[PDB]
Design a protein around this ligand. Structure first.
Ligand SMILES: O=c1ccn([C@@H]2O[C@H](COP(=O)(O)OP(=O)(O)O[C@H]3O[C@H](CO)[C@@H](O)[C@H](O)[C@H]3O)[C@@H](O)[C@H]2O)c(=O)[nH]1
Length: 412
């Protein structure tokens, strides 16, 4: 078990967001964190590098720090055979009821959880929070003297039975379980000690920070994207159920009346995600030699900062997911003042206030209508964008995410 101590984001302090949230909120926040001043609020997970969760802590911990709470962050160490197993666990918990949980696995998972719990005495802190499955078992290697919270960053609606019944022996021990959406809360758990806490975006990160026109134009020209013509964009993982092919049809029907329209299919995926690269290849084969369609991925040099650009340069952003999680992508777009058009699923039906911040449609033809409408009425589009930004500012910001943590600690 290791400890971060440093923070990439730097010294993320509430003050760094004052301009973004206003002083009434910066106060409302400071007030709620005084009643917990000097407390111990530690976090435990699997890494401080590869992961959005890690990126969240790098800003969330400093923040808690700078507001009177002695927040601290510990990580778990381990051999490949542990993460490969936890990878199986991860996929098993999210469907894929074709994986087998063997004893060799349980031994390794639990053991690794044993050795890592002898480096730091988590039970000595006022509040303990554990992130995802990898360290969920730490709770039975100490004598609780304070509340322990279980933060889940994945779906648990249709979990491989075998695997859930195992992880459940540890989860049920925590005082509270935290899920992104009220569809991830497995019934085997007491819905009174369950908590809905949507993920959040950080206004000051590479992905969301506001770039300067010159840079946006440098990234645009680099990927042969004409900013002087209209642009529609869908940011997402390349898999069979994200509407990627529907989007391609919306771009084509739209393109009959607006022959200059461009489509940006943006997606960052890990190189050990064969599934996603196959679907990627399939998309290119489907698009053919129509270069008004831009397939932009990290294979070609696209990362957080380029994604930022692509979203800012978009006139309309889509999310025709058939099956979706919370949809932080819709959150980022909304925060950038863009009207979103997407199916009503997962976090997409929650974030979009149809007809106000964006539109919830049922198919591609309904999608085509609204894209033309929006593109036709840039003022209506400016309006929908402005209100969608506010919804984010008042509901899904990292500072609002933290304030949610206070509310929970103030209720123990
Ligand atoms: O091509 C991409 C796709 C995503 N992002 C970033 O990732 C976030 C969006 O993630 P979403 O695209 O919101 O992630 P999910 O597809 O919802 O992740 C799935 O897989 C997760 C576990 O890995 C589960 O917890 C989720 O519920 C499940 O929906 C955004 O903030 C982006 O910054 C990119 O930069 N490029």
């Amino acid at each position: 078990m290791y400890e971060v101590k440093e923070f990439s984001s730097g010294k993320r302090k509430l003050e760094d967001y004052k301009s973004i949230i206003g002083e009434e909120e910066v106060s409302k926040i400071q007030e709620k964190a005084e009643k917990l001043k000097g407390r111990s609020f530690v976090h435990v997970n699997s890494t401080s590098f590869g992961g959005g969760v890690a990126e969240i802590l790098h800003s969330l911990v400093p923040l808690l720090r700078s507001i009177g709470i002695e927040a601290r962050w510990f990580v778990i160490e381990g051999p490949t055979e542990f993460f490969n197993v936890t990878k199986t666990f991860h996929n098993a918990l999210q469907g894929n009821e074709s994986l087998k949980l063997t004893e060799e696995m349980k031994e390794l998972y639990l053991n690794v959880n044993r050795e890592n719990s002898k480096f730091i005495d988590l039970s000595s802190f006022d509040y303990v929070l554990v992130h995802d499955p990898q360290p969920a078992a730490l709770i039975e290697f100490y004598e609780k003297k304070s509340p322990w919270l279980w933060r889940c960053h994945i779906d648990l609606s249709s979990p491989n039975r075998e695997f859930w019944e195992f992880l459940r022996r540890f989860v049920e021990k925590y005082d509270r379980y935290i899920f992104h959406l009220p569809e991830y809360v497995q019934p085997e758990l007491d819905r009174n000690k369950a908590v809905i806490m949507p993920p959040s975006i950080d206004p000051l990160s590479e992905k969301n920070v506001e770039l300067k026109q010159t840079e946006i134009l440098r990234i645009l020209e680099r990927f042969d994207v004409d900013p002087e013509k209209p642009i529609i964009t869908q940011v997402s993982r390349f898999d069979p159920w994200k509407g990627i092919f529907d989007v391609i049809e919306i771009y084509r029907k739209v393109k009959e009346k607006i022959p200059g329209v461009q489509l940006l299919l943006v997606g960052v995926m890990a190189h050990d995600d064969p599934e996603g690269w196959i679907y990627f290849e399939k998309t290119l084969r489907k698009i053919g030699e129509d270069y008004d369609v831009k397939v932009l991925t990290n294979l070609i040099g696209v990362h957080a900062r380029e994604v930022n650009a692509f979203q800012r340069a978009s006139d309309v952003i889509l999310q025709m997911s058939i099956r979706a999680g919370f949809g932080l992508t819709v959150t980022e777009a909304m925060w950038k003042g863009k009207p979103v058009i997407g199916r009503a699923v997962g976090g997409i039906k929650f974030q979009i206030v149809d007809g106000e911040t964006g539109f919830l449609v049922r198919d591609a033809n309904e999608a085509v209508e609204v894209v033309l409408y929006l593109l036709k009425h840039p003022e209506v589009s400016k309006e929908m964008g402005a209100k969608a930004k506010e919804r984010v500012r008042k509901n899904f910001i990292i500072t609002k995410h933290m304030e949610r943590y206070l509310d929970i600690l103030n209720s123990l």
